[PDB]
Amino acid sequence: DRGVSTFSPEGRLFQVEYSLEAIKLGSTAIGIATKEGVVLGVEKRATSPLLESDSIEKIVEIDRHIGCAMSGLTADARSMIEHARTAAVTHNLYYDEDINVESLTQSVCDLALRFGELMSRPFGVALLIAGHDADDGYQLFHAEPSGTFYRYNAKAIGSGSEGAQAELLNEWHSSLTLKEAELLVLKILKQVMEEKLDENNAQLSCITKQDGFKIYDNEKTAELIKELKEKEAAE
Amino acid sequence: NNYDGDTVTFSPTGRLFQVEYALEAIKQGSVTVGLRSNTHAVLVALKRNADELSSYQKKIIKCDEHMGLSLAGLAPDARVLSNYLRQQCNYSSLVFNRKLAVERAGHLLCDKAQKNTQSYGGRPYGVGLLIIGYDKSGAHLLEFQPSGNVTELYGTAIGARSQGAKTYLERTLDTFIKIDGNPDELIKAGVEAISQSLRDESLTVDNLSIAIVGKDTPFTIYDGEAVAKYI
Amino acid sequence: GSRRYDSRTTIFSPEGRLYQVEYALESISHAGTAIGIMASDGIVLAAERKVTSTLLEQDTSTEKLYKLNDKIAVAVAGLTADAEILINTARIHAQNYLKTYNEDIPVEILVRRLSDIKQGYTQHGGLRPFGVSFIYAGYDDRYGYQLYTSNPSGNYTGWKAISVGANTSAAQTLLQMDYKDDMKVDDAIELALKTLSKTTDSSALTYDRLEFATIRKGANDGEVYQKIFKPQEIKDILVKTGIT
Amino acid sequence: MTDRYSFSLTTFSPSGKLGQIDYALTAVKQGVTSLGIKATNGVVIATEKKSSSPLAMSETLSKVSLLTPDIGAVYSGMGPDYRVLVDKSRKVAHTSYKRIYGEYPPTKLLVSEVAKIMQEATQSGGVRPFGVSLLIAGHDEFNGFSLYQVDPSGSYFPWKATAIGKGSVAAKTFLEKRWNDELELEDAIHIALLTLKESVEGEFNGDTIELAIIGDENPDLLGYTGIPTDKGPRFRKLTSQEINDRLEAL
Amino acid sequence: TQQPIVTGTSVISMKYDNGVIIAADNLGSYGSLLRFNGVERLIPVGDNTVVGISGDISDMQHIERLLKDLVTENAYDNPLADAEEALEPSYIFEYLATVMYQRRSKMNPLWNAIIVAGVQSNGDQFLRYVNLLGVTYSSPTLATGFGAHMANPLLRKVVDRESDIPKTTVQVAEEAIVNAMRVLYYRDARSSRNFSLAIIDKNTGLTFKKNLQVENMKWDFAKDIKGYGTQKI
Amino acid sequence: GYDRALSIFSPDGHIFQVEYALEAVKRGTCAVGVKGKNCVVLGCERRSTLKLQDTRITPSKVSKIDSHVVLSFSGLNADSRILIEKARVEAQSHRLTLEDPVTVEYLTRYVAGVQQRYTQSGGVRPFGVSTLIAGFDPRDDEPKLYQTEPSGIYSSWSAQTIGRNSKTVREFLEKNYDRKEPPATVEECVKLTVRSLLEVVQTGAKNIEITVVKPDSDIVALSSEEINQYVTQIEQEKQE
Amino acid sequence: TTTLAFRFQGGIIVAVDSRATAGNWVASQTVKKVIEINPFLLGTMAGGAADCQFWETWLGSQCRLHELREKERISVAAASKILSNLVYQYKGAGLSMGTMICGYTRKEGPTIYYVDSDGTRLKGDIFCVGSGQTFAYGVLDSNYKWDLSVEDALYLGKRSILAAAHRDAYSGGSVNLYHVTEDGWIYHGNHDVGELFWKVKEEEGSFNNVIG
Amino acid sequence: QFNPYGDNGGTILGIAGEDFAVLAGDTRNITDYSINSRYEPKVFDCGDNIVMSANGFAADGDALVKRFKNSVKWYHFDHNDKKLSINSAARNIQHLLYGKRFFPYYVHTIIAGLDEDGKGAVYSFDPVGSYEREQCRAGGAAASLIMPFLDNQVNFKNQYEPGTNGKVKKPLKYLSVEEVIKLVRDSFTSATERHIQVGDGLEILIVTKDGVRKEFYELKRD
Numbered sequence A: 001d002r003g004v005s006t007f008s009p010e011g012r013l014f015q016v017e018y019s020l021e022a023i024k025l026g027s028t029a030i031g032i033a034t035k036e037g038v039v040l041g042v043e044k045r046a047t048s049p050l051l052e053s054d055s056i057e058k059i060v061e062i063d064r065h066i067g068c069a070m071s072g073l074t075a076d077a078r079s080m081i082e083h084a085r086t087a088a089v090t091h092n093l094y095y096d097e098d099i100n101v102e103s104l105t106q107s108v109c110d111l112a113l114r115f116g117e118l119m120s121r122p123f124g125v126a127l128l129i130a131g132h133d134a135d136d137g138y139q140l141f142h143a144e145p146s147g148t149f150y151r152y153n154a155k156a157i158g159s160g161s162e163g164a165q166a167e168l169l170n171e172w173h174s175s176l177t178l179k180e181a182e183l184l185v186l187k188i189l190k191q192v193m194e195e196k197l198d199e200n201n202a203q204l205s206c207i208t209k210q211d212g213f214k215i216y217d218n219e220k221t222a223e224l225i226k227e228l229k230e231k232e233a234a235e
Numbered sequence B: 001n002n003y004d005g006d007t008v009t010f011s012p013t014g015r016l017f018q019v020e021y022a023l024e025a026i027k028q029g030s031v032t033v034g035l036r037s038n039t040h041a042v043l044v045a046l047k048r049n050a051d052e053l054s055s056y057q058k059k060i061i062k063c064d065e066h067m068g069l070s071l072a073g074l075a076p077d078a079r080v081l082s083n084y085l086r087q088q089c090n091y092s093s094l095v096f097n098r099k100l101a102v103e104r105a106g107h108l109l110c111d112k113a114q115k116n117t118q119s120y121g122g123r124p125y126g127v128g129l130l131i132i133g134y135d136k137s138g139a140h141l142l143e144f145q146p147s148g149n150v151t152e153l154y155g156t157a158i159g160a161r162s163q164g165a166k167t168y169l170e171r172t173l174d175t176f177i178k179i180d181g182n183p184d185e186l187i188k189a190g191v192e193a194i195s196q197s198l199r200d201e202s203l204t205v206d207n208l209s210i211a212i213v214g215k216d217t218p219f220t221i222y223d224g225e226a227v228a229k230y231i
Numbered sequence C: 001g002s003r004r005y006d007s008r009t010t011i012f013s014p015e016g017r018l019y020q021v022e023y024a025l026e027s028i029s030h031a032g033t034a035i036g037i038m039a040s041d042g043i044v045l046a047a048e049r050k051v052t053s054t055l056l057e058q059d060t061s062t063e064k065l066y067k068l069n070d071k072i073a074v075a076v077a078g079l080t081a082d083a084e085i086l087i088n089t090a091r092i093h094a095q096n097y098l099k100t101y102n103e104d105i106p107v108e109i110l111v112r113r114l115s116d117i118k119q120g121y122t123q124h125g126g127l128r129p130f131g132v133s134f135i136y137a138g139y140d141d142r143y144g145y146q147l148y149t150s151n152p153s154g155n156y157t158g159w160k161a162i163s164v165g166a167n168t169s170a171a172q173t174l175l176q177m178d179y180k181d182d183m184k185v186d187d188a189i190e191l192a193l194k195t196l197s198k199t200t201d202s203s204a205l206t207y208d209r210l211e212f213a214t215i216r217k218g219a220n221d222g223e224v225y226q227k228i229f230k231p232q233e234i235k236d237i238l239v240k241t242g243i244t
Numbered sequence D: 001m002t003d004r005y006s007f008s009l010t011t012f013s014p015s016g017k018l019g020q021i022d023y024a025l026t027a028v029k030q031g032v033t034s035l036g037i038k039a040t041n042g043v044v045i046a047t048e049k050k051s052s053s054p055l056a057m058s059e060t061l062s063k064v065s066l067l068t069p070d071i072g073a074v075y076s077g078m079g080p081d082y083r084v085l086v087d088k089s090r091k092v093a094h095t096s097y098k099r100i101y102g103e104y105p106p107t108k109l110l111v112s113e114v115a116k117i118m119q120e121a122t123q124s125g126g127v128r129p130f131g132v133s134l135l136i137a138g139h140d141e142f143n144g145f146s147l148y149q150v151d152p153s154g155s156y157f158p159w160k161a162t163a164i165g166k167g168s169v170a171a172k173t174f175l176e177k178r179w180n181d182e183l184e185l186e187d188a189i190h191i192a193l194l195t196l197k198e199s200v201e202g203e204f205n206g207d208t209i210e211l212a213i214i215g216d217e218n219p220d221l222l223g224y225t226g227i228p229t230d231k232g233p234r235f236r237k238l239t240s241q242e243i244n245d246r247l248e249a250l
Numbered sequence E: 001t002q003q004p005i006v007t008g009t010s011v012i013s014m015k016y017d018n019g020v021i022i023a024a025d026n027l028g029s030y031g032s033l034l035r036f037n038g039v040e041r042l043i044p045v046g047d048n049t050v051v052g053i054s055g056d057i058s059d060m061q062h063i064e065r066l067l068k069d070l071v072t073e074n075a076y077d078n079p080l081a082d083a084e085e086a087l088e089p090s091y092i093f094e095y096l097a098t099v100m101y102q103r104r105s106k107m108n109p110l111w112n113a114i115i116v117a118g119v120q121s122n123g124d125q126f127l128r129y130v131n132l133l134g135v136t137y138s139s140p141t142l143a144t145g146f147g148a149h150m151a152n153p154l155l156r157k158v159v160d161r162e163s164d165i166p167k168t169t170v171q172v173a174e175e176a177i178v179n180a181m182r183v184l185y186y187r188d189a190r191s192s193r194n195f196s197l198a199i200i201d202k203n204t205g206l207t208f209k210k211n212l213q214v215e216n217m218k219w220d221f222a223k224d225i226k227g228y229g230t231q232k233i
Numbered sequence F: 001g002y003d004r005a006l007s008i009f010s011p012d013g014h015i016f017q018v019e020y021a022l023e024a025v026k027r028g029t030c031a032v033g034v035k036g037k038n039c040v041v042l043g044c045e046r047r048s049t050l051k052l053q054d055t056r057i058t059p060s061k062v063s064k065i066d067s068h069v070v071l072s073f074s075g076l077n078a079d080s081r082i083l084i085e086k087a088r089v090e091a092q093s094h095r096l097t098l099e100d101p102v103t104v105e106y107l108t109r110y111v112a113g114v115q116q117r118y119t120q121s122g123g124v125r126p127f128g129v130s131t132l133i134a135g136f137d138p139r140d141d142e143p144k145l146y147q148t149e150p151s152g153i154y155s156s157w158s159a160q161t162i163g164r165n166s167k168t169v170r171e172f173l174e175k176n177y178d179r180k181e182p183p184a185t186v187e188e189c190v191k192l193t194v195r196s197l198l199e200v201v202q203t204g205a206k207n208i209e210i211t212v213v214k215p216d217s218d219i220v221a222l223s224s225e226e227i228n229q230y231v232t233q234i235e236q237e238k239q240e
Numbered sequence G: 001t002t003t004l005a006f007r008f009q010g011g012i013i014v015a016v017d018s019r020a021t022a023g024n025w026v027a028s029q030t031v032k033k034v035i036e037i038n039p040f041l042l043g044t045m046a047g048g049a050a051d052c053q054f055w056e057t058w059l060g061s062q063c064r065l066h067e068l069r070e071k072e073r074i075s076v077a078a079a080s081k082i083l084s085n086l087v088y089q090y091k092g093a094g095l096s097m098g099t100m101i102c103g104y105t106r107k108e109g110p111t112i113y114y115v116d117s118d119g120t121r122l123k124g125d126i127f128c129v130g131s132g133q134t135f136a137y138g139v140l141d142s143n144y145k146w147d148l149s150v151e152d153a154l155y156l157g158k159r160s161i162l163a164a165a166h167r168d169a170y171s172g173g174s175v176n177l178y179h180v181t182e183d184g185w186i187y188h189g190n191h192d193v194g195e196l197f198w199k200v201k202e203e204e205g206s207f208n209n210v211i212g
Numbered sequence H: 001q002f003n004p005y006g007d008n009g010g011t012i013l014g015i016a017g018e019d020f021a022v023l024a025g026d027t028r029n030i031t032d033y034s035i036n037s038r039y040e041p042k043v044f045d046c047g048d049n050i051v052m053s054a055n056g057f058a059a060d061g062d063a064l065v066k067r068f069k070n071s072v073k074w075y076h077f078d079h080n081d082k083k084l085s086i087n088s089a090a091r092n093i094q095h096l097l098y099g100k101r102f103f104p105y106y107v108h109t110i111i112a113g114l115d116e117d118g119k120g121a122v123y124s125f126d127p128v129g130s131y132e133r134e135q136c137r138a139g140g141a142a143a144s145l146i147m148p149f150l151d152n153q154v155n156f157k158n159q160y161e162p163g164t165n166g167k168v169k170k171p172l173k174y175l176s177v178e179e180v181i182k183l184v185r186d187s188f189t190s191a192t193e194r195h196i197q198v199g200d201g202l203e204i205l206i207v208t209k210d211g212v213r214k215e216f217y218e219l220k221r222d
C-alpha cells in the first residue's frame, strides 16, 4: 500500500482522483441558474420498488436562501450539510445578516482536504450548492472533494453528467425564465435516466429571493412533466 | 519509482520524488506572470474555466494592503498558504506596528513548506506562488515553489508554457525595470509577457486578471470590465 | 514510515470474515478440551490439561478453571496469559457492579461486558485479538443456572451443554446424544467425564490431566456453592464412575 | 518523531501460531541451561555462568537474582531482556503489593505480575516478546515452598523440578529419575549439581556455576536485630567456596 | 500577582525641535533602603531609541534581555538590518506595550512604567508611555512616578502644546530636564543625586551621558530655620 | 492512538472495507420486516446446526431500543451490540433533552450516522451489520420501517429483508406486497412475513422468530406454537 | 425590569416594560425585552442585559437549527429546556436571567415556561418576572379570569406593567404588548408611560395616590 | 494585591442625523489626579464608514478597538470585500465584549455611521456587550451630566407645544449637522465646567456617504 496523502507522478492526489470515480457512479443531479431563481433537480434512483421513494433525500435545505443537491456516496454528505447549516446559522448569529453563498461554499470546501494520517479519506460525494444573496444575486456552485468549487450558470453531476452538460451547453442562455429552467432540468433528466422519468423517481426544487428554498411536492412536479411532454409533442 | 511512496524517502541519487510530483501540479497550472519596476510590482494571471458555463477560477489573492500573490497549481493549497501569510502580515502589524517585509514573507513561506517535506504522513504543497509587494525597501517580486525554494526576481512566470513569458521577460529586462512612475505601462508589459505563453486562445474580459502594488498604491485586483483597457 | 510493518489486525477479508478472529479460533482448536453441562440442580465444568509432565505440581496448579466471583466460574481454552488479563477485568467488573447496586452481578451482564471487550479488539486499535474462548458457569436469582461461551469475535451464546477447544465436533455429537433436560448434576458429572474420555488425544484419562468444578445448590438452603475439585477428589470421582 | 508503532507486531498466522512467541521460544532454546529443584525444606535454582571472554569478571554478571528476601529468579535466553525484567519484577513487588499490604507478595502472585508484563509484550503496540524463560523459586507463609516457570507468552506453571534452555530435554529426563517427594534440600542441591554437569562443556567449578537456594531464614543476613518477627531472608546465594565443597563429595 | 522589591523611581522626558530627551537616576531602592547606587535605567536600542524604565528592577532586567534579544532577532536574514529594516522606536514600543497588556491580562504583570523615546526614520520625534496595566499615552512631555507630579508641570511651562515643539531647542529642553531632576532630588525620598541623560536628535543621533550630578542646590536658607513654631534659639 | 486509514478509495472508486462489510451482512442469518396498515412485523431466521442451545438466555435477534421502537439486523453479532447500546443511550438522551421519545426516522438517522463515521475515521473498520428499525412515532399510528447498511445510507421500506438469501425473499415480497393494499391486520401481516421466510428457511421449527409492533409501545414476541400455527396452516393452503 | 405572560381562553398575553438600569442611573427607557424567536415563539428578558440578549439570541439560533435538522418547529418545552440546560452549566458563574418562553405548537397548545439562571424551569399559566414582578402580580392576580376577552386580557397585561412601572423605581419607559394564538404572535404596540399613565388615570379613575 | 483595572477618565457622545452621524470625545487622558495627556485621541475611523470609541479603562479600550479593526479586515478577506454594515458591526462587537463576560473590558462603547438606507446610526454598548440603536448617547465619566441634556435637546423630552395645555408634544425631527455640532460643543464645555476628568480638547468625527471628516476644538485645561 501507500499513504492516503500521496501525489501521483502526474501531480494529482490519488485518493481525490479515486473519489471522483465514485461520484461518476452516483445518481444524476442538475442545477440551472437564472435571473429569476436557481433550479435544482435530481434522479432519486430507488434500488427496488418496495423502497418508499419520498424517503430518498438528495435535495436539502442549508438555510432559507441556500439549497443543496448531492451525487455519489450520499451518506458522506450528512456531515457536510450539518457543517453547512451550522456555518450559516453561526454567521447570522455573529453578524445579524445572511451569509453569502460563496462564503458558505468556501466553508464546506475547507472540510474537503482535511483528511490524512482529521478524517481518514476524502468525501465520496459532490455537491451543487444554490442560493441568493444581495451582493451577487442567484448563484450555483459545484463543490468537489478536492476542495475546489466553481461557479456555474448550469451544471450536471453524477452518472449522466458528460451527456447532460453538453445538452446544458446548448440550451442555457442568459434570459431563461424559472419555468423554462424547470422544464429544461426535467427534460435533461428524462434523457440521461435509466428508468422512465416520473414524479416519484425525480424531484425538483428552487430558491428564489422572495420565497427562499422550496422542494416541490410530487403533484406540482407531475404537472411540469405533463407540460413538458405536451411541449415536445407540439413540434 | 520504489522511492516515491512518501516525502520522507530519498531516492538513491538524492531526489525527493513526492516533492517533484508536487512541482508537476504547478506545470499543469494555468499561466501567471510577475514583474516589477522600482516603483510598482505587477501580477498578471490567465484564469482557466471548467467549461463555457463556468466561472474562471481566481488566481490572485490579497494578503495585506502592501502584499499579495498569484497561484499556479492546487488552489486549496494556495488558500492555506495565503491565509498563513495574511496571519503573518497581521501579527507583524498588531505586535510591532510594522508592515511585514516581503523578504520575511518569503522566508516564512519557505519554512512552512519545508516541514511538509521532512515528516511522515503529510504531503508537500502542490502549488507555486508569485508574491509582489511594496515595503520599506521598495518593490519586490518573489517566486515560491513547494520544494520550499523562494527566489527574488525582477520578473518571472509559472504554469504551463510559462517558458515563453520568462524568455520574453529575460529579453525585456532593461525596458520594464525602468517603467517607474507609470502604472499602465508596467501592466501592458506584463500583459505582453503573458501573451508569449498563449496557444489556441487569447486574452478576453473574463479571462484576464491583473494586480498591482507600489509606492502610493494599495494592492488592488482588476477583473472584468476594468481589464478591458488592456486587451 | 511505520505503515510498512502493520499487519492490519482489524480488516475484513473479501469474503467478509475477520482474518485474525478466524486464526485465533484455529489456535484455540488445538487447546485442551473444556466441557460445560447444565443440570436442573447445578452445573459441571470439566477440562483437560495440556500434555502434562510427571514433574508438574498438580495440586497447586490452575490452567483451565478460574473463579470470577462466588456465583460464577469460567473454563478456559486458548492462551492462558491472554485469559488471565480478561479474568482480572471480569473480577473487577463484578465488584464494581456489587459496589454500585449492592447485588451480585447477573451472569449475562458479566458475560456481555467481557464479550464487548473482545469485540473491541476486532474493530479498532490495530492490536491482535485475545486467543481465548471461555465457558461461563454461574447462578443468579433471575435465570438460575446458566452456561455461556464467548470466543475471540466477542460473540456469546447460552447452552445446556457445550465444549470448547480441541475436538468440539466429536464432543458436541456425544453430548447431543446423551443429554436430557431433567438430568441431575451427578449424571452431568458422569456425562462430562465420559465425553472427555472418548474425545481425548491421550491413551487413557487420569486424574492428573484434569480440572473439575461444580456449581450446586449444595449447602444449607437456597444458597450456592462452588467446588473446585482437589486432585484426590478427581481421582475418586473417576473411580466412582468407573473410568479407572 | 514519536512512536507511530501502535499496532501489534505479534499476530496470528493462518495456522494459528503466534510467530513471534514461537521465535522467542527458539531464542530460549539456544540459551544456556538453567534449572530448579523443589525439596521438602527448600528450593534450589542453578545455571552455568558461561563467560564471554576470560578477561571478563563474571562475578559482576549475576544470572541468579534476588527479587524479594524469599524469592529468587534465574533464566535462559537473552540476558539483557532478563536484566530489565528483574528490575521491573523487583519494583512491581513494591508498587503492587508491599506498599499496599505491608508485606512481600507470595510467590505465585509475584510470578503472576511478571507473567502479565511478559504477556503485554505479546499484544501491545510496537514491541516484540521477551526472549527469555524464567524459573522463579520462593517461599511464603501460607503456600510454603514453590517453583515456577514463566515463558515468553506470559504462561507460567508450577514444577516439582524442571530445566530450560540448551540441554533441557536431557536434564528433564535426568530429574524425572532422581526426584521424589522426600528430598531434603541438601539432596536437591546435589541432584542440581549432577544434572548441570551433563550440560556443561568446559570448567565445572564454583566460579563457572551460579546456584542459589530458598531455604531457612538467615538472621545473620538481615543486617539488624531487635524485631523478633523479622528473622531474615530465605534467599541465599551459594559462594564459590560452598559450591566446591559439594563438588568433591560428588 | 506580585509586589515590587528592588525599584527605580522617576523617568522624565520631553520632545524638542529636532529630537527627544529622557533622563532617570541611578538608584535601586529596597523599600526605604537606598540599596544599590550604580543602576542604569535608560537602555538604548540601536542608535535611534532609548527605553527608560521605572518600577521593579528584576522585571527591568528581564525587559533588557527582551530588547537585546529583539535586536538579535531583527538582524536574522535581514540584509537591511542597519538601514531600512532597522528597529524603529515605534516597533520597539508596540512590542513592549503588547507584552505589558498580555502580562496584566494573565494577572502576572511586569511591575514597571516605561517611556520609549526616539526618532523615527522620517525624522519624526517618538515619545510614548506604557505601564504595568498596559495603559499607553503620548504627550509632548512624559514622566513616571513622582516625575508625573513634579516634572511634568515644569516641563509643560516649556512645551505646553504641540506647536511649542518647533520653538524649543536642545539647550532649552536639556536645561529644563536637568532642573526637573534637581527638584525631584529635593523632594522625592527615593531619588539619588546621580543620573543618566540621553538625547536622540534627527541630526546628531544618540548622545548618552552617564554620571551626571544634581548641582547648584540652594540649602543656605536652612540656617535661619529654628524650631517648629515658637522656638527662637 | 492507532491511526491507519483502513477504509480508503480504490482506483475504480470503491471503498473495499465497506463492500466487504456487506459480504459479512450477506453471510448473516436472514431478517425481514413487513409493515401493515396498523402494525409492523419483524421476522428472523435462526440457523439450525446448533442444538443444545439454551433459548431462555441466548441474545434474541430483535432488540428494543426504546419501548416503542425495535431494531433487528444481519451480520456480525458482536458488532450489532455496539450499535444497539449507542442507539439505546441516544434514545434516553433524546427523552431527557427534548422531553419526547425519538421518532423512528430520527433513531435510524442516528444509527446510520454512527455507521458512516466508522467508514471515514482512522484506526477503525466499518460495522459488518445492516439493520431494520421499526416502530411508531410518539402519538402516531402510521407504521415505520427503515433499513441501514455499513456505508451509512438509510431509507424507508414498505417491506424489506437483509442477510443470506434475502434476494430470494425480496423477490417474494416484490410480487406479493401490494402498495395500495397493505396487510390490513396483524394476522395477515404476520402470515405474509412467515410466508416470505419459508421461501428460504427449512422447517419453520425453532427456526423462525417473529416480533409484532403495534402503536403506543405495544411490542410482543410470539413463541413457538403461535408461529407454528402459521407454519402448519400455510402448508395446508399450499397443496392445491 | 418587569415582565409578564399569562394563559387564558384566547391564548397568551405577553407584556414587558422597557427600562435598563445601572444601579440608580437610568441607562435606557427604550430597550426591547421580547425576542421574536420564530413566528410562534417569544422569549422575555429580565436580569443582566448582556446575559439576556446574548443567550436568548443564541437560543434563537439553536431553535433555527432544530427546524433545519428535524424539518419541524421546535416545541416550547424543548426550546425552554435548551436555555435552562445552558444556564445550568454556568450555575455559580454569576449569570443573571429571568425569562419566559412563550409560544404555540399544535402538540402542546399555548404554553409558557419560566426559566431562570438558578436552573429553575417551570410550566405554568401565569408568571411575572423581574424587580417589579410583585407589583404586576398584585394587579394581574386580582383581575385575572380564564375567560377574559382578547381585548380585556391585552388591557390587563398593559395595566399590570403600568402598575409596576409606576411603583418600581427599576421599571418604566414604555409597555410592549404581544398576543400569541394558534396562528402565531401578534404585536400590539409600544405604549409610552409618559402618556399612558395620564390616559389610564383619566379614563379608569385610578391612581388616586397621585396629585391630579 | 494587583488590580488589573484603572480609570482614564474622559467622556464621549454620539448623535445621528438623517444622512450623517457624529461621534465626539474629549482628548484628555488621566489617572487619579494627574493628566497623562491633553491630546490622546479615543475616537477612531475603523473603515467601512464606521467610527468607534471605547471609553473608560484605556488599555481595554485600545485592545477592543484593535480587535474590531482587525475584525473588519478579516470580514473583507473572508466575504469577498463586502462592506460591513453598522448593524453587523454592532452584533460582532457584542460577541467581542461578551467573550470576556467574566473578565470584562471596562469600557462603554459607542459606534456611529450610516445604516443600509443611508440614515444616521448610533449604537452603544455596556461593558459586557448589551447593545441598542438610538438617535443619541453619551458615555464615560460625564455621561450622567450630558445624557439628560441630549434627551431634552435631541429628542425634545418634557417639551410641549405652547398653549396646548401640555397635551401636544414638541414633534420629533432630525437636526442639521450644524445644530448637532452646536449641541456637541455645548455638551462638552458644560461637562468640562463640572467634571474634573473632562477637558483640554474636543475631537469630533462626522460620518456621511462621502466618508469621515474631523473637527477639533479647545477645551479648558484646568
Ligand SMILES: COc1ccc(C[C@H](NC(=O)[C@H](C)NC(=O)CN2CCOCC2)C(=O)N[C@@H](CC2CCCCC2)C(=O)[C@H](C)CO)cc1
Pocket (backbone or CB within 6 Å): G001, G002, G019, G020, G021, G022, G027, G031, G032, G033, G045, G046, G047, G048, G049, G050, G052, G053, G094, G095, G096, G130, G131, G170, G171, H104, H126, H127, H128, H130
Ligand atoms: C449580574 O448583574 C446585573 C444584573 C442585572 C442588572 C440590571 C440590568 N442592567 C445591566 O445589565 C446594565 C445595563 N449593565 C451592567 O450592569 C454592566 N455589567 C453587569 C454585569 O457585570 C458586568 C457589568 C437591566 O437593566 N436589566 C433589565 C432587563 C434588561 C434590559 C436590557 C435588555 C435585556 C433585559 C431589568 O431586569 C430591570 C431594569 C432591572 O434591571 C445589572 C447587573
Ligand SMILES: [Mg+2]
Pocket (backbone or CB within 6 Å): H191, H192, H193, H194, H195, H196, H197, H198, H199, H222
Ligand atoms: Mg474640567
